[PDB]
Amino acid sequence: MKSLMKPNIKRVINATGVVINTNLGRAPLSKDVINFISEIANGYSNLEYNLEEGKRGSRIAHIEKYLNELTGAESSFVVNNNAGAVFLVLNTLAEGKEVIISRGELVEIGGSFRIPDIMKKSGAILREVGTTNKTKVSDYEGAINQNTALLMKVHKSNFYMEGFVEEVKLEDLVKLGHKYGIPTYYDAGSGLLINLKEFGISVDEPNFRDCISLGIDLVSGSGDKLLGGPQAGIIVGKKNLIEKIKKNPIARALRIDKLTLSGLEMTLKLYFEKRYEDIPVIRMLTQDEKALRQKAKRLEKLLKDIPGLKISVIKDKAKPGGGSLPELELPTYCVAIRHDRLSSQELSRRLRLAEPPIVCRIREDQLLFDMRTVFHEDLKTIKKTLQELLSI
């Protein structure tokens, strides 16, 4: 067409202050990682080749070692996404047999992924216990039978519940699973690699290393979330299970590509090297209450001149994680702006059609810019784009 002249996929300025943003492409990547991906993809590589033996070799093989070490699992595996990892795990272990799960955990993440729908297409039988808000242990145990193949737990990533609510301590499931000799599978989904409380964020958000040490047979999660990697189905646990999973032919359709594989490796390397500030998602969530102010007012300083603009700086409690930490509320600083000639709604609309475009949160005709998600070289382009729409 003539709308195919210029690419439809384009870089976007996130002013929503939502670190994990489903709509905006989730975790962005460090320039360190990306030059590595670029480097790998510019020409040929050792992808499925073992240079030592001069023959073809497993492409997953290196990535695994990282995960095995960082996380502590017996073994591991990686596929296209977590969605597939779930599907793969189910289809491999639970075909035609029962899978027990809480009525509180049967979740739709995104538009196209529904636990029960994919479990059906998985060829597994869903056995749902407890209630929406509350689920005891007696619920999981009571549903065990000759045909129970799997005890599964899903972590509610994109919503939370408050009020009267009960949940089952993972410790309990694993106890149950030993008693009846049923394996425990945990879709964590955020793919948090290590404990959050290390970095100054106080939350009960589960991770690989810790859940592994709990005794959960299998755990999966996304690469592109709290792990701040490329899109990836990350699976870790007991050797005999992973081996069974790898053996499944479906795993071939779910096989990760050169780019993600490399970008992932690099991401993992950073983790071993303990370079947390070099993965953008972690950085953005661990930023200092003052740093946000410092970056907030530097924008106001660039916005005062423009005609017709009332600018304020506010301090607010907002939720920072969209896809990963729904309960989390953190203090941050937003630059609020209002215009005489135009409503905020017509202002956000124009901000979306800009080049480059800018997406911002909105509260009662107060256009807001959360600085948690804003880069330093974004400021310059924000000003330039604000003056071009109104000073045209």
Q: Which does 215 bind (CB under 5 to 8 A by kind): a second copy, K ion, none?
A: none
Which is closer to K ion, CB of 258 or CB of 383? Answer: 258
Candidates 142, 159, 179, 240; binder of a second copy (CB under 8 A) is 159
Residue 9 touching a second copy (CB under 8 A): yes
Under 8 Å between Cβ of 358 and 352: yes
Residue 222 touching K ion (CB under 5 A): no
In whole angstroms, how far apart are CA 226 and each of 28, 112, 195, 203, 216?
11, 21, 11, 13, 20
Per rule CB under 8 A, count of chain residues that contact a second copy:
127
Candidates 187, 198, 153, 148; CA nearest to 172 is 153
What is the rounded distance in angstroms from the CA atom of residue 115 to the CA atom of residue 270?
A: 32
Question: Could you identify the residue written with the tokens 């964020």?
Answer: 201
**In the complex, least distance from residue 51 CB atom to K ion, rounded to whole angstroms:** 24
Residue type, 147: N
Q: Choose the binding region for a second copy from 33-41, 178-186, 197-205, 288-296 (rule: CB under 8 A).
A: 33-41
Q: Which of residues 95-154 bind a second copy (CB under 8 A)?
A: 103-118, 120-121, 123, 128, 130-134
Question: Could you identify the residue written with the tokens 């807001």?
Answer: 368
Q: Which does 178 bind (CB under 5 to 8 A by kind): K ion, a second copy, none?
A: none
Partners of 186 in the β-ladder: 153, 219
Residue 385 touching a second copy (CB under 8 A): no
Candidates 260, 287, 324, 373; binder of K ion (CB under 5 A) is 260
Under 8 Å between Cβ of 190 and 328: no
Q: Tokens for 135?
A: 């689920």
What is the rounded distance in angstroms from the CA atom of residue 91 to the CA atom of residue 324?
A: 26
Q: Which does 367 bind (CB under 5 to 8 A by kind): a second copy, K ion, none?
A: none
> What is the β-pairing status of strands 366-370 and 358-363?
antiparallel
Under 8 Å between Cβ of 93 and 150: yes
Candidates 30, 80, 287, 344; binder of K ion (CB under 5 A) is 80
Q: Which of residues 293-312 bind a second copy (CB under 8 A)?
A: none
Which is closer to K ion, CB of 166 or CB of 257? Answer: 257
Candidates 187, 210, 224, 278; binder of a second copy (CB under 8 A) is 224
Which is closer to a second copy, CB of 41 or CB of 314? Answer: 41
Instruction: Note the residues at the interface with K ion (CB under 5 A).
Output: 80, 256-257, 260
